[PDB]
Design a protein around this ligand. Structure first.
Ligand SMILES: Nc1nc2c(ncn2[C@H]2C[C@H](O)[C@@H](COP(=O)(O)OP(=O)(O)OP(=O)(O)O)O2)c(=O)[nH]1
Ligand SMILES: [Ca+2]
Ligand SMILES: [Ca+2]
Ligand SMILES: [Ca+2]
Ligand SMILES: [Ca+2]
Length: 341
DNA sequence: GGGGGAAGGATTCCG
DNA sequence: TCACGAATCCTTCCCCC
């Protein structure tokens, strides 16, 4: 089986460059302004120019401005990036029936039946890159391998504006050389757990008793890592369906005052329903981010769909539950709808 | 003993 | 300040035969 993974380069910022080309060549920072003060918030992403100086996704906007005071700072316009993405996804859909859109700027294509060997795979990769650049003026990076995980790793190694193939022979090498922390799904928490067990590479997962691994990182993560280490991981490319829709907003100031919090909560509900469109959820969860940036939530699943009036009513009750069961002040408040009919 | 579900949270980083 | 949306999985609790 041959998998071709496509990941768009510094996506949000590149889209802003496409819409305003005079931005090209200069540091561009797309920001998420939270409203607590002047430039409160964090960076969603920055172009490679800005990243050379340490400005990238996740850092505080104020910290980015200390480093690059003259960069161009733009507010994130997700709806715009989403429409551009969809167009790109429709182009890729032209190169394969088996396609998995993994996110706003990532997709996996099973090109096994329309290509022989990695030579043709590579060539199809170039045609894809070129097609997207000519049609949308968007550069992307392509990764190709025997399964989804190595196709993604391949792209990560080839970024930006690249293309790379990880053949059956390199897979074997990577299993031995690749820091296990570099494997998708292995975050900081899991990587530390694995280090303690003496697992530094995928290979290491083969000489440890499974029950021991499972006990430390969970059955699912253990079976996942072992399958990869055995060169046996082979998850099919399939359509992904959205399972939940929600919105969470930052309040000007922290609070525990119901009447002060409600307006934010209600705006979150209105936007969430607009997003749901025709989907009707049976579950609602109120999510709160506390002053110490901890996350707490309380939800309820109904035996039927939730009307907006029901959502307003139930949300207030769930919020009251949070306030009653957690003494901390609330900093961010929101809702999430799931279990669609 | 174990088959669901549901609730709240841990992790991930797919953003 | 993780200074800002969504999926999978895990633990615990609960109902039931
Ligand atoms: N709000 C927010 N958005 C993010 C964050 N990380 C990524 N995004 C958004 C903007 C990114 O352009 C988009 C795609 O994420 P990617 O991880 O693929 O990074 P990008 O595409 O920005 O850079 P890349 O060339 O792939 O290294 O998702 C984040 O931490 N917060
Ligand atoms: Ca990307
Ligand atoms: Ca991506
Ligand atoms: Ca990692
Ligand atoms: Ca990322």
């Amino acid at each position: 089986m041959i998998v071709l993974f496509v990941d768009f380069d510094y996506f949000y910022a590149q889209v802003e460059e496409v819409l305003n080309p005079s931005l090209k060549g200069k540091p561009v920072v797309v920001c998420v302004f939270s409203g607590r003060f002047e430039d409160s918030g964090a960076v969603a992403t920055a172009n490679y120019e800005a990243r050379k100086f340490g400005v990238k996704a996740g850092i505080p906007i104020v910290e980015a401005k200390k480093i690059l005071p003259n960069a161009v700072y733009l507010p994130m316009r997700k709806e715009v990036y989403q429409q551009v993405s969809s167009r790109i996804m429709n182009l890729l859909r032209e190169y394969s029936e088996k396609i998995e859109i993994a996110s706003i700027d990532e997709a996996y294509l099973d090109i096994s039946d329309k290509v022989r060997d990695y030579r043709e795979a590579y060539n199809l990769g170039l045609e894809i890159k070129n097609k997207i650049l000519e049609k949308e003026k968007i550069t992307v990076t392509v990764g190709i391998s025997k399964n989804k995980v190595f196709a993604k790793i391949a792209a990560d190694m080839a970024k930006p504006n690249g293309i790379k193939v990880i053949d059956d022979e390199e897979v074997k090498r990577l299993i031995r050389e690749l820091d296990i922390a570099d494997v998708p799904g292995i975050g900081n928490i899991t990587a530390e757990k694995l280090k303690k067990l003496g697992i530094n590479k995928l290979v290491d997962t083969l000489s440890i008793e499974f029950d021991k691994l499972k006990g430390m990182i969970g059955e699912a993560k253990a079976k996942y890592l072992i399958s990869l280490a055995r060169d046996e991981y082979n998850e099919p490319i399939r359509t992904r369906v959205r399972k939940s829709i929600g919105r969470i907003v930052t309040m000007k100031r922290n609070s525990r005052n119901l009447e002060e919090i409600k307006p934010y909560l209600f705006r979150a509900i209105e936007e969430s329903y607009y997003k749901l469109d025709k989907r009707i959820p049976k579950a609602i969860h109120v999510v709160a981010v506390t002053e110490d940036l901890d996350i707490v939530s309380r939800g309820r699943t109904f035996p039927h769909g939730i009307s907006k009036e029901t959502a307003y009513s139930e949300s207030v009750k769930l919020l009251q539950k949070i306030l009653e069961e957690d003494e901390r002040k609330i900093r961010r408040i929101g809702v999430r709808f799931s279990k669609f009919i």
